[PDB]
Structures are given as C-alpha cells and as structure tokens.
Amino acid sequence: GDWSFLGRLLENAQEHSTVIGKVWLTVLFIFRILVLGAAAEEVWGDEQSDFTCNTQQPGCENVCYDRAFPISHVRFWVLQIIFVSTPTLIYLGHVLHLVRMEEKRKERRIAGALLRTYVFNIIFKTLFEVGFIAGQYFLYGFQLKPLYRCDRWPCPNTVDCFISRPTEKTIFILFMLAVACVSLLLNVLEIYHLGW
Amino acid sequence: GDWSFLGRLLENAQEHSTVIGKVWLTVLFIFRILVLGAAAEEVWGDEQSDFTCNTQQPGCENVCYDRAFPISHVRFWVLQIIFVSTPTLIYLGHVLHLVRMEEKRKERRIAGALLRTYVFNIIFKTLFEVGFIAGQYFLYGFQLKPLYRCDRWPCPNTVDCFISRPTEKTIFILFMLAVACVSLLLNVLEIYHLGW
Amino acid sequence: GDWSFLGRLLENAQEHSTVIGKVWLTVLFIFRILVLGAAAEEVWGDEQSDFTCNTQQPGCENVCYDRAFPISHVRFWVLQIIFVSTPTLIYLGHVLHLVRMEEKRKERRIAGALLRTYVFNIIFKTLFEVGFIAGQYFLYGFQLKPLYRCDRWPCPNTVDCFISRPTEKTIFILFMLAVACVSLLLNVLEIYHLGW
Amino acid sequence: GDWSFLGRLLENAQEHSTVIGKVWLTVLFIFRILVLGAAAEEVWGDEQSDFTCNTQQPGCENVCYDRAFPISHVRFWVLQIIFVSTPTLIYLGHVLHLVRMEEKRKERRIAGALLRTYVFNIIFKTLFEVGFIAGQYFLYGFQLKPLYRCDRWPCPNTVDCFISRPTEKTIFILFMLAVACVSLLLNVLEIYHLGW
Amino acid sequence: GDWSFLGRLLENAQEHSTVIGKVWLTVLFIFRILVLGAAAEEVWGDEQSDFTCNTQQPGCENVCYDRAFPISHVRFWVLQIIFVSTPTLIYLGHVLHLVRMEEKRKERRIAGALLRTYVFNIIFKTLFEVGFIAGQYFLYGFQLKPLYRCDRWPCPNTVDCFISRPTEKTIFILFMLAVACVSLLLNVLEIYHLGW
Amino acid sequence: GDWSFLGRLLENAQEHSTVIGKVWLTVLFIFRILVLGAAAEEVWGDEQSDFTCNTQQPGCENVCYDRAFPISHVRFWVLQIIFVSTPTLIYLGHVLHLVRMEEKRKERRIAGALLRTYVFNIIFKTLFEVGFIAGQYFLYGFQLKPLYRCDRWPCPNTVDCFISRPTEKTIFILFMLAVACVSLLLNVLEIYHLGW
C-alpha cells in the first residue's frame, strides 16, 4: 500500500488547516496509516491460510471464512481512512480554486464561503467516522472469538472453525476504535473552537 | 505496481485541467489506484491458491479456475485505469507541443484547437469507461458466487469448485463500479460546464 | 512498514531539540526502527507457521499460539515506538504554533511555556517507556522458552507446543530492553541538564 | 524490478526527441513497463508452482515446464524493452557528447550527423521490435493452450501437463503484441515525418 | 531493511572525515550493506524452512535449528554494522554541536577536542569490529557443515539434521570476515596517518 | 537489492569519465543490474524449492543442491558487479581528493597522476571481469543440464536430481557472459583510445 499521494495532498491541507485540524491529520498519519502498514497488515496476513475448520468437506473452509469475514478489518480501515480524508481534499480543492481565481483577478483565511466549506468538511468527517464505527460494531462487534460455528453449504451440519490470532486482532480492533473516537473528539473540538 | 510515472504525468495534466478535471484525477488517484494497491490486490492475492474443486482429477482445478476467471478483476481494473488515463496524456502532449512551439516562435488556455482536443479527451474517456463497465458486466456481472460448476476437460462430468473470498470480492466489485460511474458523471459535468 | 512520515516529523523535532534529545532521536531511529525493520521482523516472520504442537486435534495449534502470544513482540515494539514518539510531536507542534503566531504578529528557544511543554514531553516519554517495559515483563518476561504447555479448548488435556527461534527471539528481547533502558537514562539526563 | 535508472535516461531522450518519439516513449513507459509491473508479473507469478502434470514420476514436471516454457514471456518482454530502448540511449549519448564538445569549444537540433544517428536509432528500434515479435511467434505463437503434452525424459511415454492461467496469459500476450505493433507504426511515422 | 537514515547520517560523517575514513564508509556501504541486502539475505531466507532433520518427533526440528543457529549470521552482521557505525555518529554529533555553538557565538578541522573524539571513534570502531569477529568465531567458526547432530529434548537420542546451503553460506561467512579485516586495516591506517 | 548508493557514486564517476567509460557504466546499469533485478532474480527464486531428487532419504536433496550449486549464479553476478565497480570508485575518490586539495590550496582533466590511476582502474576492471568469467566457466560452464547425478552422503548410492528452469537459466548465463565480454571490449577500446 503506497499512501504517498494521499499524504502529499493532506500535508497541503495541513498548511491551510486549523491547529486542531493539524493534530487530526497527524493522528491519521501516525496512529492509523502507519499502524496499519507496520503492524495490522501483518497480523491479518494469514487470516485465511491459518483459518482452520474441523471437516473433510471440500469447500467448507472457503465458505466459512467468507461468512465469518465478509470484509477483512484491514480493508474496512483502509476504506475508512480514505472516506474520512475525502472532505479534507474537497476543502483543499476549494482553497486552491479560490487562490487561483485570486491570482487570475490580480492578473486581470477561514471566513466567508471558505469557512462554510471548512465546517461542512468537519461535519462530513464526523458522520463518516461515526458510520464506520457503527458499521464495524454491527458487522463484527469489538472482539474476535477463536471459535466460529459454521453451517453454510457445503459444510455438513454445523462445523467448528478456528480463527487466526483472535486476541491480537481484538487488541488492534480496540486500538483502532479508540483512535477513531479520539478523531471524533478532535472534530468536536474544532467545531467548538470555531463556534467560540 | 509502481504508478509513479503515470502519476507524475497526470499531475501535469492537473496543472492544465479544469476544476472538474482535477476532481476526476483526484478520484483516479485516491479511489482507484490507491484502493487497488492498498486493498484489492491483497483480496485477490490467493485467487488461485485458495480456489478449490471437489475432485481427484489432475489438471481440473487449473482449467476450472481459468474458465471461471479468464482475466482477474484486478488486471481488468489496471487496464481500465490506463486506458481512461490515456486521453488525458494525449491532451497534455498537445498542450506541451503548443507551449514548445510558442517558445520557438518567441525565439524566432482552453480555446481553439486545444479546446477541441480537450473535449475529444472527455469523449474518449467516457467511451472507455462505459466500455470497461459493460465488459465487466458481460464477463462477470456484479457479483461473485461462492460455487462455480465446471465441466471443462479433463474434469469428469460436472465438478463443484469454490471461490476464495466471494463476498469481499463482490464488495470491491460494486465499489469499483460506483467509482467508475462517479467518474462518468464528472465527465458529463465537464461537458456541460464547457457547453455552458 | 514505512516510517518515512514519522521520521520526517522527528527530524524537525531534532532541529528544535536539545543535544541529549538529538541523541535520543538517533537511538530511536538506529537502534529501534532500523533494527526492527532489518532484523527482528524477519526473526518473527514465521512465528505461527513454524509454531508446532504435538497433537492431531484440529484448531489446537491456533488457540495455543494465540494464548502463548496474545500480541507479538514486534507489534508491541511498534506501538512503543509510536507512543514514545508522540510527546515529541506534541512539543514540535507547540513550537510550530508559536513560530506561526510570531510570524502573524510580525505581519500585524527553550524557556517560558515552551520549556514547560518540553519538560512535560520528557516526563510522558519516561512514563510510556516505563509502562511498555513493565507490560512486556508481566506479559512475557525477558525470555522465550522453547516449550509451551497448552490446555486451551479444543486441545485435549495438556499439549506440548514448540516455539520458533526461542533463543534468537530472547536475544532481541534483551537487546530491545537494553535500548529502552538507555533511552530512559537519556531522558533522566535531559531533566538533570535542564535542572542544572 | 526497478526501472528508475532507465526511466531517468529515457526522459532525457524525451527532451531531445521528436513529438512522435515522445509518444513512443510514453507508450513504452505506460503500456509496456507499467503493465508488466502492475499486471503481467503477477499473472506469471505461479507459472511453475501451479503447473501440474498427471504423473507420479519424480522430475517430470520440472523437465516438462522447462520444455513448454524455455523462457517466460515476462522475461522476454523485459529483454525486448531493454533492447528497443538501447538505440535511444545511443542517440542521447551522441547528443550529450556533442553538447559537451560545444561547451568545451566555447570555453577554448536534428540535422547533420545527429540526424543520421537519430534515423539509425529509428531503424535499429524497428528491427529489434520486429525480431522480438517474430521470435515470440516462432517460440510460442500468440496463444497458450491449457494442455501441454510432454515426452521428455524422465517422463514415461507421453504425459499430460496443465498450464496456469492460459486464457489470461493469452490476453496479455495479444495485448503486448498490439502494443509492439503500435510502436512499429510510430517508428514508421517518425521516418515518414522526417522524410517529409 | 531500509538503511536510508543511517546512510544519510554517515554521508554527513563522510563530509567531515579523513580520506581513509571515506574509504571505510564506502566499504561499509558497498561491501557490507549492499551485499547483505542483495545477496546474503536471500541465501539465508530459507534457513529454517529448508532445515531438515531425520525424525518423526514433533518439535525436534524447531529445537535443533535453534541450537544450531542461536542467532542467524545475517542478524549478527546487521548488529555489527550498526555498532561499528555508532562511533562515527558520535563524532559527527560532536562536530555538529561545535558548529552550532560557533554559529551561536558568532551571533552573540580535526584538532583539539574534535581530534580526541575522532581518535576515540577509531578506537571504539576497532574494538567493536574485533569483538564481533571473535564472537562469530566462538559461536560458529568460519564454516558451516551440512550435518548437525542434535540431542536436545524432545529429540530422541541423537538426530541427524541437515543445513540449507552450507557452502554458499560458508563463502559469504568468509567474505564478510575478509571485509571486516579490511576495515580493521583501514582503521589502523587512520591511526598511523594521524600519528604521522 | 537496493543499488541506489552504488548508482549515485557511479554517476559521479560518469561525470569524470571518458565517453567509452560512460558507455561502460550505462551497460553496467542497464544490462547487468537492471536485468538481474527485473529478470534473473525471479528465474532463480525457486532454485532450491523446485529442485527435486528421486529419493526417500532425508537430507539428500539439501546436500545435492549444495553440491550442484555451491554459489548461485545470481550471487556470483552480484559480486562481479561490485568488484568491477570498485576500481571506478577508487579513481573517483582520487578525483574528489585532488579537487578538495585544489580548493584548499586556492583558499590558502585526465593527465598526470590522475591518468595513471584511470589506466590502472581500466586494468583492474579488465582483470576482474576476466577472473569472474573464468571462474564461472570452471565452476558451472556455460550451460545447466536438467539432470544432476549426486552421490553425496547421506544419499544412498547415486541419486537423480532435477534442476529448476535449466533452459531459461542457460539463456541468462549466456546473456550475462555476452554482456561481460562486451564490457571487456569496451575496456580494451578505452585503453586504445587513451593510447591513441
């Protein structure tokens, strides 16, 4: 995963953002992207190769892994990172557009319409963070149990399947939840600093 | 996959493009290339190694995987990215050619022929996006089912084969479809902003 | 693991830090991050693939590895690196904030509030280093024995499981402990140089 | 595969090349190098690991894969890329040599000998492209069939072996052929634009 | 293994070092780091996966590999590189400290204390090189034999285990020994050039 | 394998080298380093994993691979590249030393001693290229046969072992031989251009 281009754009957003916004971006880079690439990806590397079911039925392990893990937590976190970054890019684009328009007018910061877009950016960021949190909760909860009981065809009756690294995965699930909640708190602080 | 050179050329196109065009390029970088490299490639990594068939026939799994997946979705998306980028490079080359010709004439933006080429770029982009969408539909549909029934020689009679990660793959198929459709909408908006 | 962004921010902190602080950062880069990426990650690469249990029970090896290693040492060290870096980033952010405020005031180092934040940075760094050391001790100790005895369900009775590379892992555990203790000594020297 | 150095030299050639030459280089970068690294290498990754023969004879699969695939298509394409790039480097070296000689003479573009070398570059490029095309044809054709029949010792009698991903490989074979033919057309256009 | 940061610091040391010191650094980069990353790491890649023991005893191969190879040669060489680099960083830090102090004094090379630190750097470098050489000798010798006889529990009686690539590993062991001895000679030449 | 640092130093040598020397360096970068990293490394990737022997004897495959391949061709080529580069670095160091001495004298190209060192560089380059060629010949010849007959203990009597990819490996052996011989011819041309 090469996050270079998103990083380069979000550092530009850092130049035009509030101090709390700069904190939020630093959290995104260090506590989400960096952890994901240095720690979590490895943890989940053997998610299917080390997933085992007590059965001689061909195809059962495939369908049972798929049912247990419709989307890997790491993929979900990648999507979450991209969506919570997107409004920042929208605001930065509006910034660059107004700067280029100003340069043109000359040939021939946060107030006004730019402040309205900034605050909308903070709102959409908040809603997307909340949505991904709640989706993670309703899909997986905040804990991975070692045992998964599977009755999906072709599996005969109910089969016992065993997860790879349930405890380490639970640790990182809770870590990422905490980081997301810190991000929400930062957004709320941005909207209370702007309000005040 | 190293997209550095294409990125460097498309950022140049960003300098000479319309605001909606800049949005389109940002979508290309963040929602297609970045997702492909950070999420999808991994999902499809074990497409054949985890593909299983209920048979003792040597060679059956090979032919059945090949019939089920004549071209992996990720390869198709790579090709799609390159073709929908190509017209942008054509327009940028015409731009650079006219700039160098202007420098020469001095030694010894979007209107005129450059606007005609820009609009042709938007047209070919649209047609290629549509073509890849329709091709994906007629080849795979927009869903991967866990079970694939295969009767290709040497397989005896009909054999049951099981896909790796059908649900995660379906999620990303639909995600990439949505991103492609957003790109089409952006192209249409470019041609309506230029028209108006 | 791409530590580029954290490195780029901590080199900025190096520009605004004390000489002992510069030593601390150099230790972080060379004796923790570099070792982790060049040596330790490889050592732990086959932590589960080479973990073996004397049993025919499906799922036992999974649960036994998970119980023996709730979180891999390398993941723990990654987290430790990030948390002991975080206060440095806080102090650097306060620095940049005051510099930007000074530039603004002009339009329209370690003393004062900046020295208070610096010393708080050294305090939190110390507490986090100590906390990770003590956590490592209470979780794993400072030695990995080849034999792990496991009675976790589904394992029948008690099962003998064997670790991958116990001795090399012990060497690197003790190396990382020594590096952490050197870091603590450096922090103490920072607070005694500032006191004097 | 790190193509950085060749890229850096060919972009210099881009600075001193004709517009059609610039198109040719862009095709080389985007439709050959980028595809090879982002798509094809992966397709061929399991060329031998997923190659299967219906036999209990030790060593047969090795010799049969070797006979079927004396050189992998991807290696052949790497060589082709390097050889069709080489004349460009020769011309660029002559350019730099004349520029340095001019600087020396001062201390103490395409006409003349430089145009003769340019046209020889286009000729050798054409001949090498044609040679690699014809070699690919006589070695493999333009299609990979799933079944390979092998009678090489130690294989007893004739053995049935099955290819990995024959259809995807055929798609990329034909794609690379088309790209090579487009390159030939571009060379011919360079020599007709220079002639006219 | 990403040696970028250590390289960047040691090139700074190159700017402030003696000609023989520059030779030493070049040897470090080309004959130790580059070889380690381009050749040796691969040789040792399958050190445990290809290590085989003639036994049906679960866990024996694990304990026997661990006893034969308490620390892989490549990890040892990484540590050696870092420790023999460390004094160079100390000297460079003293250099930068004196330069910054000089700039401060202005606001408000090798002689003196800087020469004393340089010579201490050469001394510690020598002692660390010697220590790693002697440690390698007492741990492994300068040759890896194909056969390792193991009686460690759970192995029943004495078991015959076979090493991966003993001869290639011996070649690289002797190569790295020779490079270390060349480094020692260079240090001795530095101290004799400084003495004279 | 990261050749960045050697490349950066050899491009400096390119700035101070003869035109034929520049050709030699370009050959080194494009036809040796680039091929090695983009093509050959992959070919040899499964050298031991796909090496098979017709035996039930534990340890025989290990010893037989080791006897057949005491050092992999790719490792040998890496060493060859480094040694044939080394004299270039020596000459470049002498160049930089004289330039720094000139700057010092001012404070307080190829003729003279610099030409003597240049010609010695060409001589050592030639001798090392010849030595590696002859060593490759006496060790492996210029062809890898599929069958290797092995009688090394523990193998009972004589065992038949089969090589991975003998034909592709032979192709690349002959390619690298041809490239080395071209390099020798270039050296001879350097010494005849200097002589004349």
Author numbering:
A (entry chain F), B (entry chain A), C (entry chain E), D (entry chain B), E (entry chain D), F (entry chain C): 2 to 109, 137 to 224
Sentences from the paper on this structure:
The connexins are a family of transmembrane proteins (21 isoforms in human) that form intercellular channels for cell-to-cell communication. These intercellular channels establish a ~1.4 nm pore that couples the cytoplasms of neighboring cells and enable direct passage of electrical and small-molecule signals (such as ions, second messengers, hormones, and metabolites)3 and therapeutic agents. Intercellular channels are constructed by a dodecameric (12-mer) assembly, with six subunits assembled into “hemi-channels” that dock together through extracellular domains, resulting in a continuous ~1.4 nm pore for intercellular permeation. Here we present an electron cryo-microscopy (CryoEM) structure of native connexin-46/50 (Cx46/50) intercellular channels stabilized in a dual lipid nanodisc system at 1.9 Å resolution—providing a near-atomic level of detail for this class of membrane channels.
Structure determination by high-resolution single-particle CryoEM resulted in a high-quality 3D reconstruction, with an overall resolution of 1.90 Å (gold-standard Fourier-shell correlation (FSC)). Furthermore, the quality of the CryoEM map allowed for modeling previously unresolved regions of TM2 and TM3, which effectively extend the cytoplasmic vestibule of the channel by ~20 Å, as compared to our previous model, significantly augmenting the electrostatic environment of the pore entrance. A bouquet of 15 ordered lipid acyl chains is held in place by each of the 12 connexin subunits, which appear to buttress the channel assembly by filling a cavity formed at the lateral subunit interfaces (blue). In addition to stabilized lipids, 396 ordered water molecules are resolved throughout the channel (33 waters per subunit). Nevertheless, these stabilized rings of water are nominally positioned at the acyl-head group boundary of the extracellular lipid leaflet. These waters are stabilized by hydrogen bonds with EC1/2 residues (D67, R183/Q171, and T207/T195 in Cx50/Cx46) and expected to be further coordinated through nonspecific interactions with the phospho-glycerol backbone of the extracellular PC lipids (and discussed below). A cluster of four waters are buried within the EC1/2 domains coordinated by residues D47, E48, Y66, F70 (π bonding), S73, S204/S192, and K209/K197 in Cx50/46.
